[PDB]
Write an enzyme that holds these catalytic residues in place. Sequence first.
Site, mmCIF file in Angstrom:
data_model
loop_
_atom_site.group_PDB
_atom_site.id
_atom_site.type_symbol
_atom_site.label_atom_id
_atom_site.label_comp_id
_atom_site.label_asym_id
_atom_site.label_seq_id
_atom_site.Cartn_x
_atom_site.Cartn_y
_atom_site.Cartn_z
ATOM 1 C CE1 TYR A 223 79.490 38.252 1.465
ATOM 2 C CE2 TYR A 223 79.426 36.600 3.108
ATOM 3 C CZ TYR A 223 78.971 37.973 2.639
ATOM 4 O OH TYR A 223 77.876 38.326 3.299
ATOM 5 C CE1 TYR B 208 79.450 41.319 7.250
ATOM 6 C CE2 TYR B 208 79.816 40.108 9.231
ATOM 7 C CZ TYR B 208 79.370 39.836 7.854
ATOM 8 O OH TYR B 208 78.505 38.810 7.492
ATOM 9 C CG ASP C 45 78.033 42.363 16.662
ATOM 10 O OD1 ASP C 45 78.174 41.187 17.190
ATOM 11 O OD2 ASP C 45 77.660 42.322 15.183
ATOM 12 C CE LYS D 11 81.833 35.165 14.166
ATOM 13 N NZ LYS D 11 81.901 34.223 12.662
HETATM 14 C C1 LIG Z 1 80.704 41.026 14.369
HETATM 15 C C2 LIG Z 1 79.766 40.093 13.628
HETATM 16 N N1 LIG Z 1 78.464 40.344 14.085
HETATM 17 C C3 LIG Z 1 77.743 39.308 13.014
HETATM 18 C C4 LIG Z 1 78.122 38.268 12.255
HETATM 19 C C5 LIG Z 1 77.040 37.371 11.618
HETATM 20 O O1 LIG Z 1 77.267 36.142 12.257
HETATM 21 P P1 LIG Z 1 76.803 34.691 11.426
HETATM 22 O O2 LIG Z 1 76.651 33.801 12.493
HETATM 23 O O3 LIG Z 1 75.262 35.331 10.874
HETATM 24 O O4 LIG Z 1 77.675 34.791 10.426
HETATM 25 C C6 LIG Z 1 79.767 38.094 12.366
HETATM 26 C C7 LIG Z 1 79.891 36.939 11.324
HETATM 27 N N2 LIG Z 1 81.241 37.347 10.996
HETATM 28 C C8 LIG Z 1 82.124 36.768 9.805
HETATM 29 C C9 LIG Z 1 83.253 36.156 10.020
HETATM 30 C C10 LIG Z 1 84.172 35.891 9.116
HETATM 31 C C11 LIG Z 1 83.680 35.968 7.866
HETATM 32 C C12 LIG Z 1 84.454 35.823 6.525
HETATM 33 C C13 LIG Z 1 85.485 37.001 6.094
HETATM 34 C C14 LIG Z 1 86.405 36.555 4.839
HETATM 35 N N3 LIG Z 1 85.598 36.893 3.865
HETATM 36 C C15 LIG Z 1 86.651 35.221 4.950
HETATM 37 O O5 LIG Z 1 86.304 34.458 4.179
HETATM 38 O O6 LIG Z 1 87.768 34.799 5.420
HETATM 39 C C16 LIG Z 1 82.446 36.687 7.470
HETATM 40 C C17 LIG Z 1 81.886 37.180 8.664
HETATM 41 C C18 LIG Z 1 80.510 38.947 13.030
HETATM 42 O O7 LIG Z 1 81.763 38.719 13.081
#
Ligand SMILES: Cc1ncc(COP(=O)(O)O)c(CNC2C=CC(CC[C@H](N)C(=O)O)C=C2)c1O
Lengths: 428, 427
Positions: free
Chosen positions: B17, B144, B244, B273
């Site tokens: 991003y 999200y 989720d 995660k």
């Molecule tokens: C709740 C939830 N669901 C799905 C996903 C996707 O997981 P991936 O392993 O495919 O990514 C996420 C991922 N969440 C994110 C956490 C942090 C960032 C960054 C946000 C901000 N722009 C920054 O850079 O600090 C983006 C996605 C999730 O939480």
Amino acid sequence: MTTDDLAFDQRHILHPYTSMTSPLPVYPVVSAEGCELILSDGRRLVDGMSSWWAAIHGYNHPQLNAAMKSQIDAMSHVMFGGITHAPAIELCRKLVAMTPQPLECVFLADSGSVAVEVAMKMALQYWQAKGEARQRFLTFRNGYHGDTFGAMSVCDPDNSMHSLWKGYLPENLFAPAPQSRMDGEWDERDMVGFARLMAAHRHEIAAVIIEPIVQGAGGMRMYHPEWLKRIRKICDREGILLIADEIATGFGRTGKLFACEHAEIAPDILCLGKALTGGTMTLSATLTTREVAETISNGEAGCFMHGPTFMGNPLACAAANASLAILESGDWQQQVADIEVQLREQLAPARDAEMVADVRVLGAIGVVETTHPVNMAALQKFFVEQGVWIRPFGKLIYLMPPYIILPQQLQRLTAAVNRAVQDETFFC
Amino acid sequence: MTTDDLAFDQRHILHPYTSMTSPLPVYPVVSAEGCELILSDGRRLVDGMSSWWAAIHGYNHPQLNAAMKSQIDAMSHVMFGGITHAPAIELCRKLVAMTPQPLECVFLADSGSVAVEVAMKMALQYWQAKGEARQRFLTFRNGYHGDTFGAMSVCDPDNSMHSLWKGYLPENLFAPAPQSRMGEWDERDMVGFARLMAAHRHEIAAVIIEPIVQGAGGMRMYHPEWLKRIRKICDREGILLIADEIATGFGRTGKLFACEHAEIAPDILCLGKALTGGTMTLSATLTTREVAETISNGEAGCFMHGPTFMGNPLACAAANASLAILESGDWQQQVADIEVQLREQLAPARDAEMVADVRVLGAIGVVETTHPVNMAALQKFFVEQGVWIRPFGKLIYLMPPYIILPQQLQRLTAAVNRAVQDETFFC
Ligand SMILES: Cc1ncc(COP(=O)(O)O)c(CNC2C=CC(CC[C@H](N)C(=O)O)C=C2)c1O
Ligand SMILES: NC1C=CC(CC[C@H](N)C(=O)O)C=C1
Ligand code: NA
Ligand code: NA
């Protein structure tokens, strides 16, 4: 591993594309080394699959192991937002140098389906930034690009059963599967369907996406390189982007480093996976051109809008770096070429079996296409009993062994294939 | 890492991003240990982010490291088609056992976005198998769920700039962002949601939401009553509920799973995660016997998904080691203590001019500001204070490892308080 373990597995663990109500047996593996899988019962099997194309250096490779372990001592993982690290820089240096010159921007990701999703978003955003209305993709029938929704949208509507999602998946354009063979001659009639679709929709197509030379999950087909030469030029003339999905073909499997080399063309967007890490863990990469990468960043968004949590994973980058270091020796060119000659010679006899429809071979891929579908539970048991791990699918009994396989190991594989198709025992 | 290494990164490596034309400073990390990141020049930083919420046990954890190297000695990877192995079996026993009773079938995959795609596909196939025309998802604004096409179709259309893909993404239903805070419950909050449910209950495959905390869409903390109400509404209409918990899972909000705050069980659960202790990528989507069998008994004969590296032994072993650390139970008080210190140490931000709100839940501390943070300037300032904190939009938040020390947590919060004083770091 106890039988209670296997019961737990059968009742609570989903496996890839397999029923949870009418299960076929799965075999417990304990370890692996070189070109062998070792079952829990001590039975040793020659791997004919490379764990689905990826384990090109076999299993327990000393170079891969030592590199993964050293990375663990520094840091297995750290986020990639606002941070960078040597494994990622090192891997992107190699990726850039080893692929077509114009391909010099790297977006690392987790899986092959995601790398494809990345390539498609890049195409959409690219045009969205140039102010054009291009949201459709042009692909070939018998193509397979992943299981996520975007990827599914460009897979064969038949193979992947698009009737299950009719109304949810976007409707893209499907040119006919290329007919001309890599073992054969070119036929200019092959191009009529593709030519027709391009004329009618040249204006709304964001990109063309295909698997170069080998269409995998869609039939292990091997088509004429003249196809890529043609598509690259058509794309050039129309100003359309070319996405090459080399997730299966990348890193020497077809005899050349990247299958695009069979046509000496370069795509605009290139997706890699599988053999990238030597099949040690999931990692993928989508490379593109400076033209594409810059255009997107200058649009509304301001940035290519993607960023998975584990992007750039140091551990996987280190393994991938070790895997490419092995390939840098060049020893693969000769391994694959020799594998090619042995598969041609030792599967040739199969053409004369009643159950067989076609035998085709390219690099370290050998395919025996049959007239009827295989009986999974039965044929798998037979392969295991011969001391080989071969996982057939539908009417395809195929091999894609590690590049380090020994001639004797390969011979066990082909002899088992030849024996399996001698009669209808294992068919229907 | 030479200066030329960094040059190469900047010109050739896409970062998440972030722009390739106006790229912003990245910091070169060489290793990591405990709760600290270590830069190329030796500077050490207290990590306030857990590598985007995943590294709940810190870095270079001996129990995680040993499980990984041992699995490497056996086999880092083998295919999962027609094969099974111990790491997968052992990990799956834990996931089934630690989750609500009905959730007893596991689909392992590679990442969060993919795990959400799997959950969506499960729902679509479920209804396809029961012969029901149901293809809509009902979600919340500010939600999200990931970056792949399916996941994007249920993210907040504004936050995720749906205009960019307008025409490619299927149109889903978006109920108002939940207003009641994690705080008093206001029945009027339900009107939006109910208005969409009545008009479309016949259409909806599943309800999908992040429980209690909507992370990337604004770090919003809502009242558990919503989950209670949605679960009942889903039971009544026979609609599937997808939770989720890729960001809320494994202790983050003070409970093992955020769903516990409402004592509810979803039909489909997405995990990621923290699942592997932030060592490498892996995800899991759990569902019920009802869903899993119905699907297999339908036309396709099975659930139609199967990524190459599904069930990766290495990742599974790491995840087993991560879940074992949690088995000790220590996270329970570690998180409660962090919650207390965050509430106390972020309270003074409520006197600062640049601040709109201070909210805290478990190991999540949020200082939402009045204006757009300047990520580059603030990032530099935090690095100069010896801490790693990555702002975005109008949020300066903390999500530290559970093992962070009191004096280390004190640094993060002091830096946060210092940062917001002062207009310097904004717009
Ligand atoms: C709740 C939830 N669901 C799905 C996903 C996707 O997981 P991936 O392993 O495919 O990514 C996420 C991922 N969440 C994110 C956490 C942090 C960032 C960054 C946000 C901000 N722009 C920054 O850079 O600090 C983006 C996605 C999730 O939480
Ligand atoms: N891209 C791929 C997708 C699916 C697989 C598995 C294909 C077939 N279902 C099999 O079991 O072999 C391999 C590669
Ligand atoms: Na290149
Ligand atoms: Na359970």
